[PDB]
């Protein structure tokens, strides 16, 4: 049925179907890859927030973080970036108690930007697929229907029997286009929402730690 | 009429409508739930502002607020956090005139963010529904039309009368898709505008109270 | 097939087809021109970051860079405009620890603005093509349908054999319009996304260098 | 004739028509009210600017402004809010001019926000209506085509008098949709331009008054 129509198609229709099949495969692979990373990031963030609010001294936390060298991810990195700069400035620039807070905030911001850039890779491709596929299907269908009109115009009379085959091979392309297009929008929206939640959590933690440092500096 | 067409449809066409019906039900439930909460928040904010600008001294108002500790919502929570931070910071290192103001402003921003986060739940589901429904409807329609013409092609020397019911029962899918898509798109913008108005109100209150604190600290 | 309809068409349809083909050629040429430059810029930035962090002294890097005064491009320029300021102002008034930082930052901002302006050329033409193209295919289709209907009205035979070729020739305009429209709409977003990453990298480098100069200044 | 076709239609299309008529009426009322409020505002602003730059002393303007308290609108508010702040801090300690300037500017921004919010009240509804009407029209058209196809499939060798109702029911929906869509789309931009011009005038006045205050403070 469908295989016969695929075989009977010309070269342009075959190419325009293969493009969409490849697009669908790539989209599914991207979704499967990204979900696990987002889940792991969420779990690590929650665990570290609980550990930080447990009530252990900050020197012990810094020692434990240094025990893992520079291989840190998520909020652990931010807490490592600020505390390193703060202690460095307090030794030298003891005169100005306001510059240390600016240094700590500047150190935290760059790190946070780096993790947020890391998390959101390969996402806009799904939006491109979901915004482009239907037009490709429409172009294929228009080509097929125009060919059908040209073929029909030759004879002075024809029934539905000799115009039936064109319809199925015309609609196959748009069916495949919709099938490829549907899941991309859902994946796009869900992944964007998860990234936003992580971003707000990071911002809240950064502001809390900056407040603690500001209280400690002016004494 | 419509019931007979639904009964005589194929399995996929019949199944493709239950999803859209469920989506519509969920959308209506979410809208009804969100409206009441937003209205209550607006009323509470107005009442608290009216009470605050009445002329009662701030100490008694703070005592009343601390009576309920932290089970507060919105402007009263912001005022409580700001006042507590102000008194705590001024108790120790009152030499600085600007550090106290900066700390109070930071605390107020922190407390406002976690309320604006709470007010904005379940909204993106409406956008997802409104962006995904028409594609499903059109896929159902395309499948129905293709199946009808394929079944027709077997019969030799047919007429339009046998064909018409197929398209008649096929267009129901796209009708239902548009019906389920429109209101979800309408409600999104209204809810966003209400959230924006509440955010503006909170920002104005925070700025006024920061100015009031600044006048006291600067002397 | 296509050539027969092109020859049998009127003058306006032929002019429309020629205009659309020219637009497609221009769009493809612009895309090909821009991709190579956008790739080379990223390659050069990645090459220079490692050399900056490799551990060589800044004075020797400045000595190396001053021999290429009129051939610098990218981050190197942002470096070169900075140091030259920091050397000059520090010779006049080294007492102020905050003036020199702003004096260094202004030149870096100017150079970054110039580089970003230079990177984005000919992009809006793609958006103009994407917005304009279908409006000409619509004109072609309407003109073809009008001619077909007036020809049918002129004759005394209500036959489909003389209205079919006009409808067949009408749809070529829409086909070619969509064909010209799609790739420009893809490339516009692709190139904007490409530029944003370079903007972020330049901002991060400027922040890190500003931090280093800030640390040096107070001592 | 046209209305007789409406009188014999189904219930759903009647509901659609009622909804669209209500939308049109609401849009017209909003346009009429906004065109008066935004016209009065501009004359008030121009008259106050002429009076301010006429050449009279500032103390007389302040006395006249405080005479008509609790009814000021527009720039008259901005002058009143900032100036009263400036004399409040200057008599407090008579030092730190930057604090005086910042306190003067903050009140002016707060006052400007209220006026802009008051001027931008009922605009987004027009945009929503203009964006949403054509799809309701499309829903009506789809229903009409469905009824026409059912009518054709009902009786063998159907005549024109039995297919007419669906075709008659299809066109009115599109006509009403476009008729309701156009004026809202016009009025949206027409009002946004006036709002932008008023905002620019307010910003210019605020900047010039701040410049005068800054010049007087540091002498």
């Amino acid at each position: 049925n469908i295989l016969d129509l695929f075989l009977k198609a010309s070269l342009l229709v075959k190419l325009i179907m293969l493009i969409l099949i490849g697009f669908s495969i790539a989209s599914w692979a991207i979704i499967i890859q990204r979900t696990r990373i987002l889940n792991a990031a969420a779990r690590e963030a929650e665990a570290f927030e609980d550990k930080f609010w447990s009530g252990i001294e900050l020197s012990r936390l810094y020692q434990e973080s240094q025990g893992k060298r520079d291989n840190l991810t998520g909020s652990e990195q931010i807490f490592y970036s600020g505390f390193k700069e703060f202690v460095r400035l307090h030794r030298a620039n003891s005169h100005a108690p306001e510059a240390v807070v600016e240094g700590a905030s500047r150190a935290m911001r760059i790190s946070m930007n780096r993790e947020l850039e890391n998390l959101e890779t390969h996402i806009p491709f799904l939006g491109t697929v979901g915004s482009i596929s239907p037009y490709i299907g429409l172009f294929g269908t228009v080509w097929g229907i125009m060919h059908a009109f040209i073929a029909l115009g030759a004879v002075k009379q024809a029934t539905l029997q000799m115009v039936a085959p064109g319809i199925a091979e015309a609609l196959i392309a748009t069916a495949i286009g919709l099938f490829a297009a549907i899941p991309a929008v859902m994946a796009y929206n869900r992944l964007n929402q998860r990234v936003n939640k992580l971003e707000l959590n990071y911002d809240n933690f950064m502001e809390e730690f900056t407040a603690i440092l500001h209280r400690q500096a002016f004494t | 009429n419509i019931l007979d067409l639904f009964l005589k449809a194929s399995l996929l066409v019949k199944l493709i409508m239950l999803i859209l019906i469920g989506f519509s039900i969920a959308s209506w439930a979410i809208i009804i739930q969100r409206t009441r909460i937003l209205n209550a928040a607006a009323r509470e904010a107005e009442a608290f502002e009216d009470k605050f600008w009445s002329g009662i001294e701030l100490s008694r108002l703070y005592q009343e607020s601390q009576g309920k500790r932290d089970n507060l919502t919105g402007s009263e929570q912001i005022f409580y956090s700001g006042f507590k931070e102000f008194v705590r910071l001024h108790r120790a290192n009152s030499h600085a005139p600007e550090a106290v103001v900066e700390g109070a402003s930071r605390a107020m921003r922190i407390s406002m963010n976690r309320e604006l986060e709470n007010l904005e739940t379940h909204i993106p589901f409406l956008g997802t529904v409104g962006s995904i429904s028409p594609y499903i409807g059109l896929f159902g329609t395309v499948w129905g039309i293709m199946h009808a013409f394929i079944a027709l092609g077997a019969v030799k020397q047919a007429t339009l009368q046998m064909v018409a019911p197929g398209i008649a029962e096929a267009l129901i899918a796209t009708a239902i898709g548009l019906f389920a898509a429109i209101p979800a798109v309408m409600a999104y913008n209204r809810l966003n505008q209400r959230v924006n108005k509440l955010e503006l109100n909170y920002d104005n209150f925070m700025e006024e109270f920061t100015a009031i604190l600044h006048r006291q600290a600067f002397t | 097939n296509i050539l027969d309809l092109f020859l049998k068409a009127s003058l306006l349809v032929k002019l429309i087809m020629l205009i659309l083909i020219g637009f497609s050629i221009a769009s493809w040429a612009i895309i090909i021109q821009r991709t190579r430059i956008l790739n080379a810029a990223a390659r050069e930035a990645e090459a220079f970051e490692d050399k900056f962090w490799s551990g060589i002294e800044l004075s020797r890097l400045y000595q190396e860079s001053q021999g290429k005064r009129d051939n610098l491009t990218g981050s190197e320029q942002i470096f070169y405009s900075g140091f030259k300021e920091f050397v000059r102002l520090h010779r006049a008034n080294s007492h102020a620890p905050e003036a020199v930082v702003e004096g260094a930052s202004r030149a870096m901002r100017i150079s970054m603005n110039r580089e970003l302006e230079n990177l984005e050329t000919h992009i809006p033409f793609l958006g103009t093509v994407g917005s304009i193209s279908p409006y000409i295919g619509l004109f072609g289709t309407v003109w073809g349908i009008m001619h077909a209907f007036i020809a049918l009205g002129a004759v005394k035979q209500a036959t489909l054999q003389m209205v079919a070729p006009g409808i067949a020739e009408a749809l070529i305009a829409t086909a070619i319009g969509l064909f010209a429209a799609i790739p420009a709409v893809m490339a516009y977003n692709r190139l904007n996304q490409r530029v944003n990453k370079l903007e972020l990298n330049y901002d991060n480098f400027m922040e890190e260098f500003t931090a280093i100069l800030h640390r040096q200044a107070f001592t | 004739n046209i209305l007789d076709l409406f009188l014999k239609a189904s219930l759903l299309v009647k509901l659609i028509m009622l909804i669209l008529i209500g939308f049109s009426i609401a849009s017209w009322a909003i346009i009429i009210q906004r065109t008066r409020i935004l016209n009065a505002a501009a004359r008030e602003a121009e008259a106050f600017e002429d009076k301010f730059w006429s050449g009279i002393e500032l103390s007389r303007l302040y006395q006249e402004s405080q005479g008509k308290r609790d009814n000021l609108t527009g720039s008259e508010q901005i002058f009143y809010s900032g100036f009263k702040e400036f004399v409040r801090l200057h008599r407090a300690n008579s030092h730190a001019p930057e604090a005086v300037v910042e306190g003067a500017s903050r009140a002016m921004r707060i006052s400007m926000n209220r006026e802009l919010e008051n001027l931008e009240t009922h605009i987004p509804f027009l945009g929503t209506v203009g964006s949403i009407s054509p799809y309701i029209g499309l829903f009506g058209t789809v229903w009409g085509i469905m009824h026409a196809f059912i009518a054709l499939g009902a009786v063998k060798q159907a005549t024109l008098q039995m297919v007419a109702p669906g075709i008659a029911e299809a066109l009115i929906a599109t006509a009403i949709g476009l008729f309701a869509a156009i004026p809202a789309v016009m009025a949206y931009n027409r009002l946004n331009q006036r709002v932008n011009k008023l905002e620019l005038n307010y910003d210019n006045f605020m900047e010039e008054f701040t410049a005068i205050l800054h010049r007087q403070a540091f002498t």
Partner: peptide, 24 residues
């Protein structure tokens, strides 16, 4: 957010074939 009804066009053209087969 947005409503896309592009594939509907693909349906309409197909129907336009039917009435060109044996009708005006």
């Amino acid at each position: 957010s947005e409503i896309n009804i592009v594939p509907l066009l693909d349906v309409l053209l197909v129907l336009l074939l039917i009435f060109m087969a044996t009708a005006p």
